Design a protein around this ligand. Structure first.
Ligand code: ADP
Ligand code: MG
Lengths: 52, 183
């Protein structure tokens, strides 16, 4: 019984390690943008839209 | 060279060279023959005063607009108006200038074809292009979407546009305009 429990736990732990290795590996892909605002109180362009 | 941006309209003809802020010459589009007899000799009385000249002698004329509802009903008078616009209000011969007329949506084909035939045969322009009167008004606002209600003096039309793609099945043209309000 102890041997069976040990082998089952070993297999489960090995699978969990294989998963968790890549789980911790590339977890920085969550870096994205937040798109805050600044009120753009300094835009003083001219009316020359020809490019559309 | 520079292009002539004419805009026939119905009630006020607005014209001017491309690239400015305001039309160079704006004047009513009316052609009025005199109706009384005339007794002074040698006064130099013409047979038809067009444009802004007939808004000063209107006391003895019978003004008649050559454009009823967008469409043109009297081609000789419209030709006279165009000739006046080119030669006296802008003083540029049309042989050396492209023209950009404007036309209301959902107008009869024959009107547009006759317009281009006149511009190419009589005035003999190098090249002319006809544009729908609402897309331009959308250009001027600096937008690229939006539904524009262009209530002129002849006809009121309502062209919706999204992202530059006009929706031809949603144009609602109504013939109530400034002239009916005047009446
Ligand atoms: N300041 C104003 N207030 C009210 N109505 C005006 C004014 N200016 C023009 N209109 C009306 O609009 C008409 C001119 O419309 P316009 O845009 O020149 O027509 P079009 O599209 O043919 O150029 C005139 O007949 C007049 O009845
Ligand atoms: Mg108009």
């Amino acid at each position: 019984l102890g041997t069976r429990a040990k082998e089952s736990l070993d297999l489960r732990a090995h699978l969990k390690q294989v998963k968790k290795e890549d789980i911790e590996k590339e977890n920085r892909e969550v870096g994205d943008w937040r798109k805050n605002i600044d009120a753009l109180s300094g835009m003083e362009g001219r009316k020359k839209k020809f490019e559309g | 060279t520079t292009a002539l941006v004419c805009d026939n309209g119905s009630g006020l003809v607005k014209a001017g060279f491309a690239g400015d802020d305001a039309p160079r010459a704006v004047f009513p589009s009316i052609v009025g023959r005199p109706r009384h007899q005339g007794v002074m000799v040698g006064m130099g009385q013409k047979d038809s005063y067009v444009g802004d000249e007939a808004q000063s002698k209107r006391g003895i004329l019978t003004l008649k607009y050559p454009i009823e509802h967008g469409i043109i009903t009297n081609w000789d008078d419209m030709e006279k108006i165009w000739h006046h616009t080119f030669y006296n209000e802008l003083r540029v011969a049309p042989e050396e200038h492209p023209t950009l007329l404007t036309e209301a949506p959902l107008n009869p084909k024959a009107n547009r074809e006759k317009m281009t035939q006149i511009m190419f045969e009589t005035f003999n322009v190098p090249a002319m292009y006809v544009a729908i009167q609402a897309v331009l008004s959308l250009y001027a606002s600096g937008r690229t979407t939006g539904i524009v209600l262009d209530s002129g003096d002849g006809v009121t039309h309502n062209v919706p546009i999204y992202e530059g793609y006009a929706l031809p099945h949603a144009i609602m043209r109504l013939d109530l305009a400034g002239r009916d309000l005047t009446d």
